Design a protein around this ligand. Structure first.
Ligand SMILES: [Ca+2]
Ligand SMILES: [Ca+2]
Ligand SMILES: [Ca+2]
Ligand SMILES: [Zn+2]
Ligand SMILES: [Zn+2]
Lengths: 160, 173
């Protein structure tokens, strides 16, 4: 069906926070994850603090109000939905994980950029270096983090 | 959907069912549940017997839906899944691999050995260095330091088994 957002300007809201890291950090990683995609596409993002935005970012454990309950600590780390109304475009992070500002454990920014990529209408990549790869790939330093060319070509074939 | 795939021993322990089966036919989708299901012909069952012709998995890729990529219809796969409401569920993260692709040691593990370290030992995933060890019963799984994934020396030949009461170390199969 080629699902994608039918609008250039999207909104996002961080509904809850994790106790694993400060709220400032959660915000920083989310806005950096959105920037990764803003810099490649015509997409722009505005933050809401109330109401329901296009992309609603939540932390959750086990059963949490959708058809796909998380699986405790380990295995799955997060999921998201394709663009669309309602739950579509939302991102759920398993909070039975230990989320980090830095690159130890599970970096919140890495997983957020992946899931946002799903929220924008991308599928998984077979290239292990690509950000849309399903397995969690931790980087030795986030300084030289680069968006893969497979990821750019996908998101640009969706949005231009 | 971002995943940290478990070690095969971890997968043998968290799974309610471990079977050899052949995937038969395309998936059928039920939009009420948001899950799809594949018809399977079970060949052998290494872990289970408390509960097969269908396996269920989420319907979309982004919510960790397992999408069968094999085209050979006679190929046996090893499936390790969980039982929700008497139904066999797997994800993108479940340990599902062709039976022939597993090393001889992994086959020994599913058949006999992995269950020996199931009650007391624990494979602990190391996603970064420094990695913290939590107890003498955890084996640090450091194959993440390489390209990653189930292709790794500790996955293909080693199991987290007990040497002493209270101490589990990696051992060979
Ligand atoms: Ca989890
Ligand atoms: Ca939404
Ligand atoms: Ca946590
Ligand atoms: Zn969810
Ligand atoms: Zn994904």
């Amino acid at each position: 069906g080629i699902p994608k957002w039918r609008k250039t300007h999207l909104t996002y809201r961080i509904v809850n926070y994790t106790p694993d890291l400060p709220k400032d950090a959660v915000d920083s990683a989310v806005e950096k994850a959105l920037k990764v995609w803003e810099e490649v596409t015509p997409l722009t993002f505005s933050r809401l603090y109330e109401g329901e935005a296009d992309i609603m970012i939540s932390f959750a454990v086990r059963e949490h109000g959708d058809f796909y309950p998380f699986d405790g600590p380990g295995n799955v780390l997060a999921h998201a939905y394709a663009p669309g109304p309602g739950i579509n475009g939302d991102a759920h992070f398993d909070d039975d994980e230990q989320w980090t500002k830095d690159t130890t454990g599970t970096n919140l920014f890495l997983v957020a950029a992946h899931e946002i990529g799903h929220s924008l209408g991308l599928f998984h990549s077979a290239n292990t270096e690509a950000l849309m790869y399903p397995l969690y790939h931790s980087l030795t330093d986030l300084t030289r983090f680069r968006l893969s060319q497979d990821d750019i070509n996908g998101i640009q074939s969706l949005y231009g | 959907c971002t995943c940290v795939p478990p070690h095969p021993q971890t997968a043998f322990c968290n799974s309610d069912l471990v079977i050899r089966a052949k995937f038969v036919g395309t998936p059928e989708v039920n939009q009420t549940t948001g899950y799809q299901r594949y018809e399977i012909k079970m060949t052998k069952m290494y872990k289970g017997f408390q509960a097969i012709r269908f396996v269920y998995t989420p319907a979309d890729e982004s919510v960790c839906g397992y999408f069968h990529r094999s085209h050979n219809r006679s190929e046996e796969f090893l499936i390790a899944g969980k039982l929700q409401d008497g139904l066999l569920h797997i994800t993108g993260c479940s340990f599902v691999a062709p039976w022939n692709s597993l090393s001889l040691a992994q086959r020994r593990g599913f058949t006999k050995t992995y269950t020996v370290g199931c009650e007391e030992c624990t494979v602990f995933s190391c996603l970064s260095i420094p990695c913290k060890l939590q107890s003498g019963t955890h084996c640090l799984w450091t194959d993440q330091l390489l390209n990653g994934s189930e292709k790794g020396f500790q996955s293909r030949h080693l199991a987290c088994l007990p040497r002493e009461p209270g101490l589990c170390t990696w051992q060979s199969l």
